[PDB]
Design a protein around this ligand. Sequence first.
Ligand SMILES: *Cc1c(COP(=O)(O)O)cnc(C)c1O
Ligand SMILES: *Cc1c(COP(=O)(O)O)cnc(C)c1O
Ligand SMILES: [Cl-]
Ligand SMILES: [Cl-]
Lengths: 334, 334
Amino acid sequence: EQKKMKYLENLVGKTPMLELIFDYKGEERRIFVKNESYNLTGSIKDRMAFYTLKKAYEKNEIKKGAPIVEATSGNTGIAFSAMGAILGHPVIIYMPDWMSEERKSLIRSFGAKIILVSRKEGGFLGSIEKTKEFAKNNPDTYLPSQFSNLYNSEAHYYGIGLEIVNEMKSLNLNIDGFVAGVGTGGTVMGIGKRIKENFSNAKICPLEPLNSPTLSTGYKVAKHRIEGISDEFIPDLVKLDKLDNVVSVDDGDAIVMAQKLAKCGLGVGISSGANFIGALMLQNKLGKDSVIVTVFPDDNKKYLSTDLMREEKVKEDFLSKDITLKEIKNVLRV
Amino acid sequence: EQKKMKYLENLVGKTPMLELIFDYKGEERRIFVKNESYNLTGSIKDRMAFYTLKKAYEKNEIKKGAPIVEATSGNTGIAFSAMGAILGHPVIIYMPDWMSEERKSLIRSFGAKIILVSRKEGGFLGSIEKTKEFAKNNPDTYLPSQFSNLYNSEAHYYGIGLEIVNEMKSLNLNIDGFVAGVGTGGTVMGIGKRIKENFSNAKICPLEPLNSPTLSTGYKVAKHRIEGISDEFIPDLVKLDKLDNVVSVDDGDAIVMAQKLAKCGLGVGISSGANFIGALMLQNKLGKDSVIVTVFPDDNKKYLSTDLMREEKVKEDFLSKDITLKEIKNVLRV
Ligand SMILES: *Cc1c(COP(=O)(O)O)cnc(C)c1O
Ligand SMILES: *Cc1c(COP(=O)(O)O)cnc(C)c1O
Ligand SMILES: [Cl-]
Ligand SMILES: [Cl-]
């Protein structure tokens, strides 16, 4: 069983680190990005689901057969569904009734059971509250509580974090900076802890959609298209008085940016375009030659009837418009 | 440039090998499968596109900027689109006008240009013939000719083949057998060459849909749902008088089988369910305890409005019905 937990680490992590070179009005810059599609269900939330349940078993927090229950329509639902099944747990996912058939289908394909929450019945906030309710009534239940559970960010401190840190040292470079958009805060907290232990002067910045500057303002919640991040509150996991300044990207700018990365061979999700632009924002402010790291949480295959496959009206302040990708200068993997 | 070609090998291969244990009426059996979603565009045809173009540059068969042109709606289109862009070539894909918006979108997302071929204008056969025509008129053109190009199967002899062979020796096991469904024949020929060099008594069997026993009959072409394999002719690449007997799986049986693998945590495409069942057919005939290897070419995310997300009428001869997946007993990766 520690044999099982040991070998299954092999279905996650160890993803490519790419050096991307581009032209930014028009001087040549570069970003380093980890590509997280190279995982069991194609996102970074595989590293997190696996770890959450490995540690959970280690501390008797979950028993064989217990129901795993969470609120998402995104990769967390997917990651937990597939590892739940691998480890033999039932999985229940709670989500807003308005999710697309596309999403529901995927989560469902892994055995997980779908309970839709009306508008009304609380909506997204509803679904979170409905998970807690289920667990009061089924005490058996294991809740990942993805927005507050420390096991999430630890996942990234021990996993993608170590990886990032080493891949960069291996090019004899320091990390001057890291940016990641925040859904749960796990990535930016976990990786950011790890980067700071090795690169004491780096800047760890959390990313928010400029359309919904929840993190930078403390209250504002608005419609945005960057899936995976910036839900309608500040997750407990994320700790702003301990991070550097917040970066903010228009969802339009991001979409476009992800359009361009695909066009140069990297099919990614909208969040990945946001990170990229964020990473350049952070570069603009630390120095044209700083090393900036970010992540590409998933690939484009799920986003195929989203604004990602449509012309975006460009706007004056977008950075995407000034950016031209030249090449992939390097790929590491270890 | 041999620096570039060298580092980009890092965006493909080195995928997990899983030992799957299951119950087959009801005695316990096992299959080993390589999981090929863990690649740049999520399929096995990444290994092949990369290799085809690496060797092509090595032999001056393609020049910077030349247009890469091929006929597919599947992973080959996708793989070639994304590596073409990475390496700066234009890509044109020819496909039947009736392809779904879903497919077109994906191929397009990577920069590749879409020419649809009527029914009429030859259909699928049309599209192949239309690629040749384009290249008569644009002599510049690089054709992958995926159904006849030896560089395809070599890809798998040097790549997934080596990997398979070593991963199995590392468990102190011989390969008694391998099965792979045949679209181009690259997988089964390339891997099969490699397996035979190390496991001289293994059986290398090509897989066909029972609904369309083109390979076993020499002529029959019929409607089937297993995407990626058994188009409407026998590809030149595949060489039947040099392989073992053909296995044949109902597309319904396959679909179901892929339903079940997802439900146990492995989201796969229909072809992957076909391979699995094939692998068991081959096991039934060599001995309940033979080691059989097969491949899971891609994941389920593309197949999301296909018969994969619908109840299949079960039938007497299906093996899926008698199969119960217990667990993933092991995962290797090196
Ligand atoms: C979860 C997610 C994010 C954000 O990661 P957190 O660690 O949850 O902040 C970004 N993009 C996508 C696609 C995600 O699923
Ligand atoms: C191409 C493909 C196959 C068959 O592989 P060949 O080497 O072309 O025979 C099987 N499944 C899928 C999804 C494929 O794209
Ligand atoms: Cl700062
Ligand atoms: Cl035989």
